[PDB]
Every structure is written in C-alpha cells, then in structure tokens.
Design a protein around this nucleic acid. Structure first.
Ligand SMILES: Nc1ncnc2c1ncn2[C@@H]1O[C@H](COP(=O)(O)OP(=O)(O)O)[C@@H](O)[C@H]1O
Ligand SMILES: [Mg+2]
Length: 729
DNA sequence: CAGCTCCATGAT
DNA sequence: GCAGTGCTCGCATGGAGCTG
DNA sequence: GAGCACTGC
C-alpha cells in the first residue's frame, strides 16, 4: 500500500491551486474565517509573486470572509459571486497560455526535422510508434512528477523522492573495489546532509563545477548510512532560481537509448513549436459555452502544465473533443432517419395477453419493461432502433417474440436475421413451436432450401401472408420483396445497412448477449435509442465458478471424466503460444471423444462444429478462438479456460455463459499459471460476480475499452451529457 | 520463452 | 557528405511485471 | 563520451 498512500497524504495544503481549491470546497460548504487565515500562512510558491494576483486576491479573500456574519440571502449571492471568480482566477493565472507565432510548419515529417532528434534517435523514437510529429503529440506522458513543493531539510521523509533546497559545500569522491562514490553536501544552515552518488564521477565536475551556491536538489532518501542520518541519493541539483524547476514536469514512455532527461529536453524543444500549428476543430461558439481551451494550449497542457488545473482543463478539452466526434456522427445518422421517416400502428392487447397467459413461467418486471418500451417505440410516428440487451438466459428471446406478434398483429410483416444457416434452422423451430402456432406463417429461406421452395417463398413475401421470414443476411443479398415490412430483428455481429419500406424506416431491433454499461452504450453506440437491459429470470441457478491453480490441473481433467461419464460435456480453451495438436493428443491421454476448432481458420460454420458437438460427436471440445454466443450445446455441464486473463473479463464470460443450459447446474474451472494480484485481483472478482454488467462496470474501471483507440476519457460522464445538449449541431 | 521497461540497489 | 566546435545530458546490473 | 546542431569546405 506504501506508495499508493504517502505522497497522496502530504498533498493538500500550500500551493495556490490547492488553496483556491479548498476555498471552493470552503464555500460549497462553510467558510471558517479562522481557517482561511491559517491556509494563507502556509502558502508558498512562485505563482504568488504576481502583484495583482496578490492584490486581486485580497479583494477576494476579503469578500469571502464576510459570509458567516451574514444571514441566509446575505450568504448566497455572496457565494456564487465568489465561485465565479475562482474559476475566474484559475483561468487568469493557473494556465500557461501558449502565446504563439513565427509560423506553422505542418506535416508528417519523418521526425528528423524534429530538433535534437537524429538518425539513431530516429530509430529509437519509432520503437514508440513515433514517426511523423503528429506522432510526437498524440504521444502524451505516462504520468507526471511534480515538484513546485519543496521539503525542509530535517523533515526528509524516510524513503521518498523529494526536492529540498540549500547550499552545497562538499565534493568528495570515494573509490573502493568495484565501486566509487561521489559526495557533496548541502547545508540549509544548521543541518548538513550527505547527498551521494555512485558510478558517476562526472557529476564530480559539475558539483565542483559548482561548490558555492545554494541550489535545488531532487532525489530520494535512504534509511541507511549506518553511521546514521539518512543520506540522499540520486538527486538532480539544478543551479537554480527555479521558479522554473519548481514545476510539474512530465514522464514519458522510454526505450533503452533514451532517458527522461533526454526525451524531456526533446519535448521541451519541440512541443511549443508544433503545438502552435493546428487548425482549430470545434467552433468558437462552443468553446465559449463550456470554457476549455482550443488546442494549441490543450495539447500544450498535456506536456507542460503548471497547475494540475491546467492539465485538467486540457484533457477535458481534449476529451470532450473526441466524444463530440462521436455524438456528432450519431445525430448525423439519427437525423438522416428523421428524414426518411418511420411508421406506426395500432395494437391488439389480444395477442400478447394470449401469448403471455399461454406460457408456464411468470415473466419479469424487467421483460415487462422490455415490452412496454418496444410496443410504444414501434407505435411512435417514427423508426425504432432499440437494442434488446441482456445476458444469456435472461429472457431476451420471449420478448423478441412479442415484438413479433405485435408487429404481425399490427398489419405488417417482420423479418428475422441471424448470422448462420445452422442458427436460422434452429431459431425457426423455436419461433414456431414457440409460436406453437396461432395462425402465423413463418419461413426460412437459406439457400439450403430447394430452389422452388425458395420461389414459393419469395413470392409468398412479395405479396400476402408470409408473416416472418427466418434467414441469414442471405436475404438482403439476393434482393427480396414484400410491400409491407414492419420490423427487422437481429442477432449480433454479422461479418463485414438499414431497411426502408416504400421510403419510410423499418422498425429495427437488435438483441445482444454481451452487455455493455450505459455510458459505453450511450457513447460508442448511443444512436440505438435505447437498450432495454435485462434483470434476470428465476429458478435460475448459476454456475459454481471456481478458480484453480495449475499443477492441480489434472484435477479438473478428472472431474470431467466424471460429469462426462455421467453423460455431460466439457469445453477446453487454450489461447495462443501446434502445441494445440500437442495439447490435443496428449489430451487423448484423456482417452475417454475430442474435437478441435483451431478457430481463426474462421469459416463461420464454426457452428458446423458445435452442432456436431451438441448432438454428441465430440464428447469434449478444444478451444482457441473464443467460441461465440451461438448454438448451444445442451449437455455441456462443465467449462475450462486455461492460462486466462489474456481473455478480457468478458470473453471469459462469454465462455462461462456457454455452459449450464438445462439446469445442468454446470461448472467452469480456470487453470492459472503464476501472474498475480491485479491479474488475480480480477479473476477473484470475476468468480464472485453473479452479474455481467457489474462486470463491465468492472472491466472499464480496470482495463480501458479492449472490446481505433480512445485517446482520453476514463469515466467522468458530465461530458457524455455535455454532449447531448451542445451536440445537436 | 523471450524481449523490454521500470524501479531499486550498489559500500565501511 | 564528412570533419571540427561546442551543447546537453551521461552508471550498470538484476529482479521486476507485461505482451507476443 | 553519445547524439545532434551548426559552420565550413
Ligand atoms: N420469465 C421466465 N421465467 C422462467 N423462465 C423463463 C422466463 N422467460 C423465459 N424463460 C425460459 O428460460 C430460458 C431463457 O432464455 P431465453 O428465453 O431462450 O432467451 P435468452 O437465452 O436469449 O436470454 C428459456 O428456456 C426460456 O424459455
Ligand atoms: Mg436469443
């Protein structure tokens, strides 16, 4: 917990921003005259040395202090009057406004134009994916080491990079065996504090190059020098005046070759230059609305801020920007739908009331909602693009079927789409035996079907009472007709379009097995007016998920021999490292019923194979290619992911999903190797996560969206709304 | 199994 | 394009988690 | 000293 907790601690008092900060916290709650007066005592830092800033302030701190000796109203206008000025202040002072000129040059150079960079660095730098120069901005720091704050000498906190100050009087160098030692030492006045260097002599020069002045030293502390008194190693001792080395300064990815001090001076010398050249992107009317910097400065800020406030204002600008890009394209779609327009219709509680009472089980207040929502949106004078989202076995299917009656019941006909012929056939059965009948004629049209039959069908649709067609994105590729088509159901990712009747829009509905938390929903997809998400069905018991060490792997192996001997089946997934084949017939020392599926060898008659698994031809399987949310092998009691977490926390879900059906009270182990905490911190979490959305919650908070590549927004969301509003035009 | 990075140590 | 100043910044090794 | 800019031939 050490690091993750110490700098954190000694990080509140003593620097304008922190100050301003707190004061805002001050008001947003309650002053404390007393207090202020003690914050001001602790202030320290170069920013303050501005006249107004100082004058400007008094005025301020003076206005505030009055709060308390003030009844209710007397307090308000008082407050907002403030708050406004802080931000007012912050904007004035806290940012290093990049005042620009000379003139822009602007392309993708092969980076040698870069200054300081040269041949070998050329190659070095490209190990970081840095060609071009745009390449040299879109490349922001790992992190930031700050400094501004200077520690006193004799308060060195045992074991920590600090930056203290003082003279320096002592340049000794010591040689031993396979080691030297360079020392000079720093003298506040009273204290004197060893400051030691290892296999560097040069330093000798500089330090001597120096003896005289007082300076700023930046290093670490060490609990040794068993003679006592702490010893500071590794520092930097810059001559000084450092109003200008009492700054935040970045930390970039490195690459044997370069050094921070290197890489830095290299950003130090170009960024200001480049930044400057960037045609603004979003219009000035916006900017003004919400208040964070154009670009130049923003990009500026990500490298060389002087207020974490800066940096904040910089991501914030830099991130809204790129959500804009999305929500722009969205409406820009959503609108085009407003053109072509949609169609509604009336609806007979008849059907559903029937369907619903027909079933055995209950229904959920969830699916109920799925329902109230679909109807209504279909009904509405325009399109519907809902997303029926849920978690394998939540009741997605049912619901779809109501969509299917309601639409039929209305007047028009629906058209089910699905990635695979094998899946079509299979779905078909259900919608019918499901529809168990009433009075609806539903088809499939899959190319397997005999040419005539096709014909009898096609024609069936061109006119009349073929009520639903079940097929692949086969339909759309041949060019079918029917002059009423009131909806299109979809299952999932079909490889790699919308439908219009005469010219209006077709009620579109898309179901998915792999959840996605609302923000991500509303941010990469959003355009799917909604997602009526599911909260799950009863009687439903769930996978006893277990996590198992390796070695004991032959343990699980056996557990199957059983369950599988008692008539069940077992997946076995092994990522990438041929071994597979080696993993295979060494696994027919599990002699018994095995099948393979290399995977991305990806004919998507993968199901071809699963069918055959579900039918009972490969007692057990063998992965690679994380199997998908598809044809469902019933008997499959147990699952086995190995050397995981290479798998997102979701593919694993996928996998867990795939095994259970029945009640079957299925089971899924996961062999592990070594790895650790953060890794297993996660797994551990998986296993007890009854619920696959709090999964995504959790996949986000930890690894950024693995599911090209977002530069900037790690869930704060006021943006994703800041969007909707500004984000029409 | 390897190739790289990042971090912490190295001296009586 | 190579040859001569004059800058800035320069340890090395070993175990470490990470991705391929 | 490595790497690079910059100046000159
Ligand atoms: N309300 C319910 N209560 C109990 N079982 C239900 C309920 N709704 C659906 N089921 C059944 O439980 C399983 C749910 O999965 P399903 O409805 O096929 O959709 P999906 O797997 O896509 O979520 C099916 O057997 C379905 O028939
Ligand atoms: Mg389904």
């Amino acid at each position: 917990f050490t690091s993750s907790l110490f700098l954190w601690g000694e990080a509140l008092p003593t620097l304008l921003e922190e100050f301003l900060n707190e004061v805002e916290k001050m008001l947003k709650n309650q002053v404390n005259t007393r207090r202020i007066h003690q914050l001001l005592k602790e202030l320290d830092d170069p920013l303050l040395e501005n006249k107004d800033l100082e004058e400007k302030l008094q005025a301020f701190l003076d206005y505030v202090k009055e709060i308390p000796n003030l009844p209710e109203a007397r307090k308000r206008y008082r407050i907002q009057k403030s708050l406004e000025m802080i931000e007012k202040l912050r904007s004035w002072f806290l940012i290093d406004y990049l005042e620009c000129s000379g003139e822009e040059v602007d392309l993708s150079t092969d980076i040698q134009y870069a200054k300081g960079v040269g041949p070998n660095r050329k190659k070095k730098l490209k190990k970081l994916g840095i060609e071009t120069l745009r390449d040299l901005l879109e490349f922001f720091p790992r992190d930031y080491e700050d400094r501004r704050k200077i520690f006193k000498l004799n308060d060195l906190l045992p074991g920590e990079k600090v930056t203290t100050q003082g003279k320096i009087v002592s340049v000794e160098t010591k040689k031993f065996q396979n080691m030297n030692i360079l020392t000079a030492v720093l003298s506040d006045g009273l204290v004197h504090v060893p400051l030691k260097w290892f296999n560097q002599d040069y330093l000798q020069t500089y330090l001597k190059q120096l003896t005289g002045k007082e300076v700023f030293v930046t290093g670490t502390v060490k609990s040794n020098a068993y003679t006592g008194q702490y010893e500071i190693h590794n520092a930097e001792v810059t001559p000084k005046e450092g109003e200008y080395v009492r700054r935040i300064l970045p930390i970039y990815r490195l690459t044997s070759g370069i050094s921070q001090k290197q890489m830095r001076k290299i950003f130090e010398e170009n960024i200001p230059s480049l930044c400057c050249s960037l045609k603004e992107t979003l219009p000035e009317r916006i900017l003004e609305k919400r208040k964070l910097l154009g670009v130049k400065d923003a990009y500026y800020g990500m490298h060389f801020p002087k207020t974490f406030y800066h940096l904040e204002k910089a991501r914030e600008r830099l991130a809204y920007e790129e959500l804009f890009v999305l929500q722009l394209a969205f409406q820009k779609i959503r609108k085009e739908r407003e053109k072509h327009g949609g169609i509604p219709k009336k609806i007979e509680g008849k059907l559903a009331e029937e369907f619903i009472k027909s079933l055995p089980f209950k229904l959920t207040n969830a699916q109920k909602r799925a329902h109230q929502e679909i109807r209504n949106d279909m009904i509405s004078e325009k399109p519907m693009n809902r997303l029926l989202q849920g978690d394998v076995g939540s009741g997605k299917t049912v619901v779809a079927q109501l969509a299917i009656l309601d639409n039929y019941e209305a007047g028009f006909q629906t058209a089910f789409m699905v990635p695979t012929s094998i899946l079509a056939i299979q779905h078909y059965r259900r919608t019918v035996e499901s529809f168990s009948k009433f009075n609806i004629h539903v088809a499939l049209l899959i190319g397997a079907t005999t040419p005539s039959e096709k014909e009898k069908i096609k024609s069936g649709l061109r006119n009349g009472q073929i009520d639903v067609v079940i097929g692949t994105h086969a339909l759309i590729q041949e060019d079918v007709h029917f002059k009423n088509l009131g909806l299109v159901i979809i299952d999932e990712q079909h490889r790699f379009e919308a439908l219009m009747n005469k010219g209006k829009m077709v009620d579109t509905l898309v179901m998915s097995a792999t959840p996605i938390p609302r923000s991500m929903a509303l941010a990469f997809y959003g355009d799917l007016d909604v997602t009526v998400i599911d909260e799950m069905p009863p009687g439903r018991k769930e996978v006893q998920t277990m996590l198992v060490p390796m070695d004991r792997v032959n343990e699980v192996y056996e557990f199957v021999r059983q369950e599988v001997m008692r008539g069940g089946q077992a997946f076995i997934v092994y990522p990438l490292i041929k071994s597979a084949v080696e993993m295979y017939e060494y696994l027919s020392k599990e002699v018994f019923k095995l099948g393979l599926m290399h995977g991305r060898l990806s004919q998507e008659e993968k199901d071809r194979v699963m069918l055959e698994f579900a039918e009972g031809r490969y007692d057990i399987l063998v992965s690679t290619t994380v199997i998908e949310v598809g044809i469902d092998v019933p008997r499959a009691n147990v699952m086995v992911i190995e050397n995981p977490e290479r798998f997102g926390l979701a593919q694993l879900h996928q996998l867990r999903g795939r095994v259970g059906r029945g009640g079957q009270e299925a089971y899924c182990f996961l062999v592990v190797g070594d790895v650790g905490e953060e890794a297993m911190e996660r797994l551990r979490f998986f296993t007890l996560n009854t619920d696959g959305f709090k999964i995504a919650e959790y996949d986000l908070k930890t690894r950024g969206p693995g599911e090209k590549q977002h530069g900037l927004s790690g869930f704060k969301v006021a943006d994703l709304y800041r969007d909707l509003k500004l984000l029409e035009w």
